[PDB]
Design a protein around this ligand. Structure first.
Ligand SMILES: CC(C)c1cccc(=O)c(O)c1
Ligand SMILES: [Zn+2]
Length: 258
């Protein structure tokens, strides 16, 4: 009876195994565009993905993760609110059963169909496992997905999903270029928060882009054909793998843009 996104093991239950669920810097949050503060001290984000090396795609039972070689500084995030260099380890999405929900962060209470998380860890901590123990360990770049025109740079991902339908399945996934998932603008909001799944550790500088990417209805429909279950177990569609907005508490969201 481990955590998940059902009635009996979903977000309202997580605090029993993971008490930090009710902590002081949990994610996601609603982004109130009118009360976010423009911060002129914030730097442009530096997204350096030209040498990114993707390796594998994995159904981990709650998402599909596209994994990168993080054994060197090949795909790094810097600048913005960060001090130091953060290496890309993996990206994944959170999505809904319907186009009107699926994002974790919301914008003036608006839910997008999905949210992309590009996960990076602070190289001064040496590895991801160590980084998650630290208040500045991770930098997650969050990008909203709306349904409309297809995102061509997403289709290679969509096309391999039928090979990792069930929990624990993996497939080789080389030469995928994550630059193909980024919007035009790197205008962002930023705040200190947490992993949005167990263990809910409070180790994340969130960087949420203002501009959504468009994906097609067919693209997101293919996300919804994945399974939470293992092969040979009863079929539970992998949908609604998002945590709702948490209390902002003693935090202010900062904007990079006016
Ligand atoms: C694999 C889990 C712990 C995780 C790690 C890091 C970032 C995320 O956005 C997320 O949803 C989940
Ligand atoms: Zn995530």
């Amino acid at each position: 009876h481990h955590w998940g996104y059902g009635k009996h093991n979903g977000p309202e239950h997580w605090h029993k195994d993971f008490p930090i669920a009710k902590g002081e810097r949990q994610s996601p949050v609603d982004i109130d565009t009118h009360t976010a503060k423009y911060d002129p001290s914030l730097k442009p984000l530096s997204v350096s993905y030209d040498q990114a090396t993707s390796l594998r795609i994995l159904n981990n039972g709650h998402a599909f993760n596209v994994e990168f070689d993080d054994s060197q500084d090949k795909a790094v995030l810097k600048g913005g609110p960060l001090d130091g260099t953060y290496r890309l380890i993996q990206f994944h999405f959170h999505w809904g059963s319907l186009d009107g929900q699926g994002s974790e962060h919301t914008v003036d209470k608006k839910k997008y169909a999905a949210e992309l998380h590009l996960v990076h860890w602070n190289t001064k901590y040496g590895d991801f496992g160590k980084a998650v123990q630290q208040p500045d360990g991770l930098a997650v770049l969050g990008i909203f997905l709306k349904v409309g025109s297809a995102k061509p740079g997403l289709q290679k991902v969509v096309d391999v999903l039928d090979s990792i339908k069930t929990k624990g399945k993996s497939a080789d996934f080389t030469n995928f270029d994550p630059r193909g998932l980024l919007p035009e603008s790197l205008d962002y909001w930023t705040y200190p928060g947490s992993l949005t799944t167990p263990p809910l550790l409070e180790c994340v500088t969130w960087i949420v882009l203002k501009e959504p990417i468009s994906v097609s209805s067919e693209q997101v429909l293919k996300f919804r054909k994945l399974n939470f279950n293992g092969e040979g177990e009863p079929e539970e569609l992998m949908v609604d793998n998002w945590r709702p907005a948490q209390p902002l508490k003693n935090r202010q969201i900062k904007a990079s843009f006016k």
